[PDB]
Amino acid sequence: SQIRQNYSTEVEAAVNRLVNLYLRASYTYLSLGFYFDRDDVALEGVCHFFRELAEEKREGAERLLKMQNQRGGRALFQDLQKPSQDEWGTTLDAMKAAIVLEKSLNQALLDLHALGSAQADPHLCDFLESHFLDEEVKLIKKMGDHLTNIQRLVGSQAGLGEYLFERLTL
Amino acid sequence: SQIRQNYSTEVEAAVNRLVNLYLRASYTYLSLGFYFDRDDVALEGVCHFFRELAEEKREGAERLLKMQNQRGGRALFQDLQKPSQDEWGTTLDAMKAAIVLEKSLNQALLDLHALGSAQADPHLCDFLESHFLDEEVKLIKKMGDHLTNIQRLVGSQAGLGEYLFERLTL
Amino acid sequence: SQIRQNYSTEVEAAVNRLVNLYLRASYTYLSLGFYFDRDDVALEGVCHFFRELAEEKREGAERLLKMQNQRGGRALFQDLQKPSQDEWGTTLDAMKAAIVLEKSLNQALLDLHALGSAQADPHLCDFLESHFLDEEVKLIKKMGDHLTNIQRLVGSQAGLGEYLFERLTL
Amino acid sequence: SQIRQNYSTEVEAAVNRLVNLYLRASYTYLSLGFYFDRDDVALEGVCHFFRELAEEKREGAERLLKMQNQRGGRALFQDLQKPSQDEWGTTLDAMKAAIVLEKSLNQALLDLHALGSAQADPHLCDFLESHFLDEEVKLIKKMGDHLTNIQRLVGSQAGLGEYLFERLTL
């Protein structure tokens, strides 16, 4: 590529795997979203929460793709494996799975940043730090806040607590 | 001081101790605030309540400092001892500690007013009455109102009650 | 903590010491401020300069505290030792002490950034770089500019020079 | 008087003497003002400063007079003795004489407040505290600030310092 400069094949490859990870997460959140829209789940607030994240993750992947093209790398796409579950249980169950998924994106982000550090690629490190590392941190903190409130609520009557959380927080 | 008039050394000294008391209270409220912002406490309303008071107390100290300079006294600052606790328990626990702290500022205010009375210092008495005595009374009354509601709520299920209070009152 | 990830105990501890350093600096600047408001000092411009910095440092500490909570660390507070002086001399003396204090915050900032580098904590490094390292650099440069002007002014008649600097620069 | 209640003859008499004191001060400030408007003094800023105070003192006397009528007392007027000087020297000399005059009004205010205290007249005490005691304190503090700046300025060349103070402070 006539424009490629200081952009290692390892980082190119890792950016592609991260793209697949973000599309995978987008897909999980779309499935989380429409599950809470089922007439027998019916928590419209939990649905909007996860459907917004589906959009967030999709834009994350698109951003990585644009950066890949900006550095002269080649986008390569792979199969997107389906979400890990077909039914997601309670809001509590869903929030736990969401935070597990976000911690796995964060670790991959951190792993990619460390690779850019080893490759002396400061543009990649700055790219990850501006548009990803901090947004992951804020988001995992919100999910943690939500978990604490769902748990304090689903004490003696989980039913009431799930309704109240959806109504008054989400 | 060329401007000092009817301003006793005892009142000067007491105004300085009150300044330290107000900064101390500001500090306690900052610690109360960030405790309720912990991902494992996660009561954003309780956090905003105490962080606003941290600002209130800080401005109280600044006001006493400006008055000290207006009377020709000399501001002298001392160490600020850390808050009395590192974790503050429940909203109920926090509200109880807040009201204990406000009653101690009120008593110091009242003690200083009585000193100004003994020193025949009407400007100090008017200064305390306009900007402090009544704001303490309103604030202790709110904290009392909040305590009554937290207690009526944290009956059979404290968890639900703490969430509802944070959501619907704060 | 359910959200803690790639956040070492050493950085947690250092963030807490930095919080104490920023509150300490806030306190120094509050004392610098009210000293220049004394009827026998009476340099209202020098007072506004240092009182704005007291606010700046206080918000710096609050920002570190919010970041501590975002990473799953625990805020721990310590005594705040009083400012190093009770009277601050001339504007020149005050500006010199201010720049010594800012260089000490800068060094602690730099020391913490190096720790995050050693701990491979890129979110901390980005956090310090966005909200602290550059603002310290701009501020020390202003204080340096002010020092140069105060010194060029307090030549044959320091009295006139101190008044002119306060009137025409601050 | 059909409306007089809890208003002692001693306070009535003292309010009348205070009225004479405030008109006397108004008169002094009018003379200070027009002195600095002389073509051979020519400090228009010092003139505006003292002429505004002439207005302030005149309104102070009018306020005491209205309060006297509100309590059922009888306003009695006496000769107004001329200002203590015909020429007022430098701005420094004038500021010193102004602060001496304001301290004498403050003491009379304080003396009258103590009389109202002895007479158990809380309306008089509140009247003095709302409209007089604090405005005296702020004003003596400004005059003190001005004195400090005039003195720091009239060091090696009083001429330049007097011009600069008038131009850049007043």
Swiss-Prot record, chains A, B, C, D:
Superkingdom, natural source: Eukaryota
Record region (Catalytic site for iron oxidation): 52-59
Xref: PROSITE patterns: FERRITIN_1 (PS00540), FERRITIN_2 (PS00204), FERRITIN_LIKE (PS50905)
Domain Ferritin-like diiron: residue ranges: 5-154
Pfam families in alphabetical order: Ferritin (PF00210)
GO molecular function annotation: ferric iron binding; ferrous iron binding; iron ion binding
Miscellaneous remark of the record: In horse spleen the light chain is the major chain.
Family classification: Belongs to the ferritin family.
Functional summary from the UniProt entry: Stores iron in a soluble, non-toxic, readily available form. Important for iron homeostasis. Iron is taken up in the ferrous form and deposited as ferric hydroxides after oxidation. Also plays a role in delivery of iron to cells. Mediates iron uptake in capsule cells of the developing kidney. Delivery to lysosomes by the cargo receptor NCOA4 for autophagic degradation and release or iron.
The protein, known as: Ferritin light chain
